Amino acid sequence: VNRCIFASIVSFDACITYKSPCSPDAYHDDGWFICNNHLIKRFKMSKMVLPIFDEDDNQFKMTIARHLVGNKERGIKRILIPSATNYQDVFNLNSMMQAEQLIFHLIYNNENAVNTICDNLKYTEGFTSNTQRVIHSVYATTKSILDTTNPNTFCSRVSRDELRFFDVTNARALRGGAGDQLFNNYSGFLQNLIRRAVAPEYLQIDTEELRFRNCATCIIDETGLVASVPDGPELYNPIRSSDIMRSQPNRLQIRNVLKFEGDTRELDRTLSGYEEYPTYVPLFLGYQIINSENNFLRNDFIPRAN
């Protein structure tokens, strides 16, 4: 079963049918409820797994995502997951079909906009005995996923052993900060997506710290989950092509690429049979505590509530 939230994007008109392009990872029961293709298209992130090894033989993999924000980009083009008070500006929902707009409105709990879409679609002819049950299928699937990830849904089993503080100052004191308050403000599905994409900088398991990176690559500010380093210039993150070129093919866009000139093949062969260190930018931020007694190694998503 497709678990990508954006799997329900269809055309409210009956004739044209649109099976949204979803990567094969959509059907996996991983913590994610979004596919890699859609995560790239909308939240401009790529899914990856961070494997943590012990000393002798045991490796457990956590999830992580790498953002796709160029260093040159600035402003509203750096936010990966916008906040509910600015998302309608970062996302150009107007040019996003109608089903995608409905899903986005539901993700951010904008029932008013959803009802406006409802009214607009009720006015048109061929809605009652046609578009109805189609908008209903979209809404039902989206709400099902959102309540699956919402810990407050009725009788919704919620994990509570593990804690996640996106502010590392007082994390060892068992307490978050302003970023953590903003995180709590988010919708359950968005909170889960952030907890998946953004790996914790520190990992306190059984009182043992396992600091992974020495500096956070992202920040949770008011604008949202920004792909900005809190020190000096932004990280060089080259993105080549063929990820979102599905964008309207008639939309003429300019792009300032940065090419290297010169023969690199001799240098390449000089040092070729070496393990290559990847140059992506992972999403590292915050602190995660496993709390000794727990069930961290459970192969089934359960909502995590701080």
Instruction: Choose, by CB under 8 A, the member of 121, 219, 229, 235 that binds its own copies.
Output: 121
Residue nearer to Zn ion on the CB measure, 38 or 67: 38
Q: Pick the closer one to Zn ion by CB: 38 or 195.
A: 38
Other CB atoms within 10 A of residue 262 CB = 5
Greatest alpha-carbon pair distance for the chain in Å reads 68
As measured in angstroms, the least distance from the Cβ of 230 to its own copies is: 27
Q: Which residue has the tokens 């899914």?
A: 47
Binding mask 267-296 for its own copies (x = CB under 8 A): -----------------------x-xxxxx
* Interaction partner, residue 251 (its own copies, Zn ion, none; CB < 5-8 Å by kind): its own copies
Options 124, 170, 181, 184; binder of its own copies; rule CB under 8 A: 124
Binding partner at 193 among its own copies, Zn ion, none, C-beta below 5 to 8 Å by kind:
none
Alpha carbon distance 232, 230 (integer Å): 7
Candidates 90, 89, 95, 49; CA nearest to 69 is: 90
Nearest to 223 by CA among 39, 91, 127: 91
The one among 112, 207, 214, 270 contacting its own copies by CB under 8 A? 207
Long-range contacts of range 132-136, CB-CB < 8 Å, 24 or more positions apart?
A: 134/10, 134/12, 134/14, 135/12, 135/99, 135/102
Among 21, 28, 74, 115, the residue binding its own copies under the rule CB under 8 A is: 115
Specify whether the CB–CB gap between 218 and 283 falls below 8 A. yes
22 or 198: CB nearest Zn ion: 22
Task: Produce one character per residue of 2-16: b if its CB has 16 or more CB atoms within 10 Å, e if not.
Answer: ebbbbbbbbebeeee
Contact 215, 229 (CB under 8 A): yes
Which residues in this chain contact Zn ion in the complex, by CB under 5 A?
4, 6, 22, 26, 35, 38
- 2 is a contact residue toward its own copies (CB under 8 A): no
φ, ψ (nearest 5 deg) of residue 185:
-65, -20
Of 118, 174, 178, 267, the one binding its own copies (CB under 8 A) is 118
- Residue 6's binding partner among Zn ion, its own copies, none (Cβ under 5 to 8 angstroms by kind) is Zn ion
Summarize as ranges the residues that interact with its own copies (CB under 8 A).
11-16, 54, 56, 60, 92, 94-95, 97-98, 114-115, 118, 120-121, 123-126, 128-130, 132, 135-136, 139, 154-155, 157, 205-208, 248-254, 256-257, 290, 292-298
